[PDB]
Structure formats: structure tokens, C-alpha cells
Write a protein that binds this ligand. Structure first.
Ligand SMILES: COc1ccc(C(=O)c2cc(OC)c(OC)c(OC)c2)cc1S[C@@H]1O[C@H](CO)[C@H](O)[C@H](O)[C@H]1O
Ligand SMILES: COc1ccc(C(=O)c2cc(OC)c(OC)c(OC)c2)cc1S[C@@H]1O[C@H](CO)[C@H](O)[C@H](O)[C@H]1O
Ligand SMILES: COc1ccc(C(=O)c2cc(OC)c(OC)c(OC)c2)cc1S[C@@H]1O[C@H](CO)[C@H](O)[C@H](O)[C@H]1O
Ligand SMILES: COc1ccc(C(=O)c2cc(OC)c(OC)c(OC)c2)cc1S[C@@H]1O[C@H](CO)[C@H](O)[C@H](O)[C@H]1O
Ligand SMILES: [Ca+2]
Ligand SMILES: [Ca+2]
Ligand SMILES: [Ca+2]
Ligand SMILES: [Ca+2]
Lengths: 121, 121, 121, 121
């Protein structure tokens, strides 16, 4: 398994040791509090009231946890994924990223703690 | 494994099909949006700004997900637990409960979608 | 999980650390060479040519690996069981035993090396 | 997971659905009775008394279960593998094969029933 943190201010995102291969089943659990700028903080599902001004993932809220698998588009993680199979034909290293608008990470704060494991299959 | 909804207004809580036995390793993933009364909604970590006015779980925020195992006291769940082993001598049915003040659940709204599975041991 | 040795000359068999609980899924893998008396040796499936002269398990060959779960009768194991669920209402410690005729274990030799794990459920 | 039969008389072997990838933990359970020619039959550990006359796998007995992983050389399976990882730089499709001398498969009979699963990591 992999265990680490994802900083809200990291535009590049946090590379993990997990390589998603075809047929893999994985479980992700994410926790913690972070901000895209404001004083308030939000958990891994982010801020359901904030408008999307060009987020790196249009299928999750501003301040939510998202990922890429290899060269893929952004995929919502939020609080996690239970015994999940990639619905698309994606393969490769998982990178975790805080959902914010490109070029606006500098004022972000906080972090999520994240576990990723492969399940039986 | 078990998958189901934990209603915010369900004061008795949601009994699951999971019996926790000594040595069991479990994973929980919880998602969704709910309120203890206000117009706003919060995830399974609840509302970090809201004071404790007599919650069923003093170790989690108002609006968070908690559980009991058989006749245990409440245990925080929040977004979930990854390959978790019970610290205390506990056993029996896992029940999932929305964290609010007893007798104040009537004005609650939303639900959390929750998966629980036993892991390889 | 549990790992250990099942000696062919141990009429009581080997009590393992595994407590089989309702709903568990288990995997057993057994390996090695053992004898019920002759200079020849046989693997965990035993000797398919040998008549049953009062074996502890009538559903496996003489020299096979078998088990008991709590107060059950003998259940054939042979080379192992893959993601296996016990009959309804069978529960308790798993005991591994070499299949021979009671009172005839003293001339036995060799052992099976066995792994038992709980699988995801 | 994969489940299927490996015939003793199939020189090329049984190609499975399992692609072994770097990091994968696998379990195999093999069972059954087969012959390399004589009237006797042996399980997946094969015949410990038969000399090696140019077997496809010098590390296992004649009549044992063996495998190839992608372009690897033969690797013993015998009764199976419990939560096993392959050597570095061994990867690809698993093919299961009865251990005999090339060109001598036609007088073989019987089959092994095999299960292969990927385990939690
Ligand atoms: C207290 O935090 C904010 C309040 C409003 C905005 C807006 O930019 C905004 C702009 C609007 O019109 C131009 C608008 O509609 C009238 C609106 O509706 C609520 C919000 C952004 C932020 S944080 C700000 O968020 C962005 C991400 O969207 C970046 O993360 C930035 O670094 C943050 O400071
Ligand atoms: C808009 O909701 C409220 C207005 C006033 C109060 C006061 O505490 C005065 C609390 C609440 S939330 C209020 O929170 C409590 C728990 O602290 C109960 O869940 C109650 O039903 C809620 O209305
Ligand atoms: C070389 O070792 C043996 C040879 C024959 C027997 C028989 O008792 C036997 C008797 C038969 O008919 C009367 C028979 O006819 C089909 C047969 O066929 C192969 C074998 C047992 C044994 S080992 C002996 O085995 C027993 C368990 O069966 C005990 O484990 C004992 O300790 C061993 O010495
Ligand atoms: C070394 O391998 C053998 C040698 C001889 C035989 C016999 O068929 C045979 C025939 C006899 O009469 C004509 C006989 O007289 C009593 C005898 O004594 C033992 C054996 C079979 C085998 S198995 C052989 O194994 C190889 C692998 O090593 C191949 O799998 C082959 O296909 C098998 O036949
Ligand atoms: Ca920002
Ligand atoms: Ca309330
Ligand atoms: Ca004996
Ligand atoms: Ca042959």
C-alpha cells in the first residue's frame, strides 16, 4: 500500500508508488482539512458552494481531492474509492492533486492524509 | 461486504450486515452531504466550526459519521478507516450513526453512502 | 494468517491460530511429502491406490490433509482450498490433521507445510 | 481471478487470463491427478522417484505443475503459491504447463484444476 500526504498548494500534485494496471481493484481513503484561499477549510469533497472558474477537474468541487492515472484526465477521488476499477482504459502511476484553478495554488493551505491499497482480484 | 445509506435524521442509526470479530481488519469509505439543521451541508467529517452541544460522540464534529460495534460507545468514522483493527475488546454488529445531539435529529437532512468490507488478514 | 507444520505422526493434528467465524472466506495452501508407513511418500492428496481401512476422513485418501473447524467432523483439504466458505453454522478453531487410521499413526513420517489466510469479504 | 484445467497431454500449456505485473502478490491452488505415461497418477508435485530425462522444468519433478510468466523460463508451481511475488524483471501472461520431456506429451493423461487470484497489497 501507499500512505502519504497531498499539500493543497502543490499544483503538480503528489506522485504515489501505486501503478494502476488493467483489472486492478483499489481502495483509497482520504481525510483532513484544506483551503483554496479563504479562511474556512473543507474536507476532501471540497466546497459545494464555490463556482468552477476553470478547475483542473470539472467533475469535482473546488478544494476536492482528485487524481491522474498515467496520462489520464483528472478523476474525482473525494473521500475515497471502495474496491474501484478504472471505468476507462487508464494505466500508470497514480498522482493525487488538490482541485484548484491553474496558476492559483499559491494561496492554498492545509493537506489531506491519503491511503491507497490494491484489493484482491 | 455491506453498502448502504446512513440518513442524517435516523437517530437509532443504520445497522449493517457486518459482525466485527476479534482480529478482523476492516475498511470503511463514506461519502455524501448532510446537515444537522442549517441550510449548509457537510461531508462525513461534519462541521469543524460547530460547538459540541451534547453530541452522541464528543470525539467527532457535529454532522460527522460515527459507529458502534455491538454495545461499544460511539467511535469516530469520518471519511472512513483503512485496514483498521479494533483497539478495544469489541464484537458484534457495526451500527453507523450521524453525530448530532439526542432529540435534535428531526430537522436533519441528507445521508452518507457507506461501504464496509473485511480485508485480507 | 497462520503458517506451520502438520506432522504425519501427530494423531491429534495441529491446532492453528485461525478462528473460522461465520461469513469468513479463507485460502489454504499445503505442500510437502509424508507417509502413513511405507518407504514411499505422497503429497497432500494422499495415496489414491490405498484402501480405506477406517480413516478419520472417508472423503479423502489415506495420507491426505484434512481439517476440523471447531466441533465439526473431518473436512478434506488436500492441496488446499481457494477463497472457501464453510458450511452454514460451522465455526471455531481450525485443526489440521493427517488422514490415517486411528492407532496407526506411530509409523508415519514427514509433514505438510501449510498456510492459512483470511481473504477479503 | 482465473480458474481452469491444465491438461497433461497439452505440450504448449494452458494460457490463463492472469497478467502478472510488477508488485503483484498472487495465490495459486492446484489439485488433481495426472500421468506422464504410466498407469499410476500423481498430483501437482509430480513423481519424486522419476529421473529428469530433459524436462521443461529442471527445478520440479516429472508430472509436476509448472508455469511461465511472459518470456520467463519455467518456474515450479507444485501444489501452488501463497501470497507470492515473482522475481524482478519477470512479468506478463501466466501459462500453466504439465512438466514432461518435449515431444513426449502424447501418452499423458489427466489434468490439474487450478485457481489463480491476485492478493491485497
Ligand atoms: C472568499 O473566496 C472567494 C470568493 C469569491 C471568489 C471569486 O472569484 C468569485 C468571482 C465572481 O465573479 C467574478 C463570482 O460571481 C459573481 C463569484 O461567485 C461566488 C466568486 C473567489 C474566492 S477564493 C479564490 O478561488 C479561486 C478558485 O475559484 C482560486 O483558488 C483563488 O486562489 C482563491 O483565492
Ligand atoms: C440554523 O441553525 C441553528 C440556529 C441556532 C442554533 C443555536 O444554538 C441557538 C443552532 C443551530 S444548529 C443546531 O445544532 C444542534 C446541535 O448542536 C441541533 O442539531 C439542532 O437541531 C440544530 O438546529
Ligand atoms: C506397504 O504398506 C501397506 C501395504 C498393505 C496394507 C494393507 O493393509 C492392505 C490390505 C488390503 O486388503 C486386505 C489391500 O487390498 C486392496 C491393500 O491394497 C493396497 C492394502 C497396508 C500398508 S501400510 C499401513 O496402512 C495402514 C492404513 O491403511 C496404517 O497406516 C498402517 O500404519 C500402515 O502400516
Ligand atoms: C524412463 O521413463 C520410462 C521408461 C520406460 C517406460 C515403459 O513403458 C516400460 C515398458 C516396459 O515394457 C516394454 C517395461 O518393462 C517392465 C518397463 O519397466 C519399467 C517400463 C515408461 C517410462 S515413463 C516415460 O517418461 C518420460 C519422461 O521421463 C516420458 O514422459 C514418456 O512419455 C514416458 O513414457
Ligand atoms: Ca487558490
Ligand atoms: Ca439537528
Ligand atoms: Ca500409519
Ligand atoms: Ca509422457
Amino acid at each position: 500500500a501507499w500512505k502519504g500526504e497531498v499539500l493543497a498548494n502543490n499544483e503538480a500534485g503528489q506522485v504515489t508508488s501505486i501503478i494502476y494496471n488493467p483489472g486492478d481493484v483499489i481502495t483509497i481513503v482520504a481525510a483532513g482539512w484544506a483551503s483554496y484561499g479563504p479562511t474556512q477549510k473543507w474536507g476532501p469533497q471540497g466546497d459545494r458552494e464555490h463556482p468552477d472558474q476553470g478547475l483542473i477537474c470539472h467533475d469535482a468541487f473546488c478544494g476536492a481531492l482528485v487524481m491522474k492515472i498515467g496520462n489520464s484526465g483528472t478523476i474525482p477521488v473525494n473521500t475515497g474509492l471502495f474496491r474501484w476499477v478504472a471505468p476507462n482504459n487508464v494505466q500508470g502511476a497514480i498522482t493525487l492533486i488538490y482541485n484548484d484553478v491553474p496558476g492559483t495554488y499559491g494561496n492554498n493551505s492545509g493537506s489531506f492524509s491519503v491511503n491507497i491499497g490494491k484489493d484482491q482480484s
